[PDB]
């Protein structure tokens, strides 16, 4: 679970 993976979760569901 990379940092890029979660940041994409945060941006896409913000």
């Amino acid at each position, epitope marked *: 679970p*990379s*940092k*890029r*993976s979660f*940041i*994409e*979760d945060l*941006l*896409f*569901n913000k």
Partner: antibody, heavy 131, light 109 residues
């Protein structure tokens, strides 16, 4: 370094079409990838975007529920699956390399010599939907 | 989403003229704005990001300004390759982005 598009053509309304966008020269697995379409004589309109891992997707309201974006990182290729196509979907479709989210600061506070986003575009693909 | 407007839609200038293009955002986007150039038969290519920051390889004659709602793209002296259509792009909602309708610059006569 390029984005090479394949597919497209003339289809009847209600049929399905698949667009492919193959990348080379950049680390495909790092960047969000996007699809943009330009209707004849019109502006650029947002279609869909996919996260680097592929778990996250967003869509334009006009295509939601009808369009599906997908990526195969093992082949450095982006896909757009178009179903229940309408005449309004007639446009020239572009794939664009998006941002690696680790450099999100560059959008508001540039840190490097360049912005590593929206720097590579596909050649474009014509999609005409007509009976 | 955020609606971007551009005035004017069409613009005429001579080579060696100063061109200023305006972009307006329906809501505050801070400096989350980029500018693009599209020529017929080609994909748009990035000129400016973060409202005022020049993308690498882009000539110094292009400059951008503004924060919040109102934004400006300035070409200090139009060059023969500059005749084209210019779009602004809000990046505030990234990964979602929307473009302005565009300003087309043709040669004055």
């Amino acid at each position: 370094v390029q984005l090479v598009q394949s597919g497209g053509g003339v289809v009847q309304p209600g049929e399905s079409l698949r667009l492919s966008c193959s990348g080379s020269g950049f680390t495909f697995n790092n960047y969000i990838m996007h699809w943009v379409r330009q209707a004849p004589g019109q502006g650029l309109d947002y279609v869909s975007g996919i996260g680097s891992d592929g778990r996250n997707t967003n869509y334009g309201d006009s295509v939601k529920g009808r369009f599906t974006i997908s990526r195969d990182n093992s082949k450095d290729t982006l896909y757009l699956q178009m179903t229940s196509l309408r005449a309004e979907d007639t446009a020239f479709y572009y794939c664009v390399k998006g941002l690696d989210v680790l450099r999100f600061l560059d959008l508001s506070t540039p840190s490097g010599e360049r912005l590593d986003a929206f720097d590579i575009w596909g050649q474009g693909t014509m999609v005409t939907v007509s009976s | 989403d955020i609606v971007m407007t551009q005035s004017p839609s069409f613009l005429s200038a001579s080579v060696g003229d100063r061109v200023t293009i305006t972009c307006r955002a329906s809501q505050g986007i801070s400096n989350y704005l980029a500018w693009y150039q599209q020529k017929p038969g080609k994909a748009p290519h990035l000129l400016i990001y973060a409202a005022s920051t020049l993308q690498s390889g882009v000539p110094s004659r292009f400059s951008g300004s503004g924060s919040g709602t109102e934004f400006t793209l300035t070409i200090s002296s139009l060059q023969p390759e500059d005749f084209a259509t210019y779009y602004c792009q809000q990046l505030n909602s990234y990964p979602l982005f929307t473009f302005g309708p565009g300003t087309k610059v043709d040669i004055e006569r």
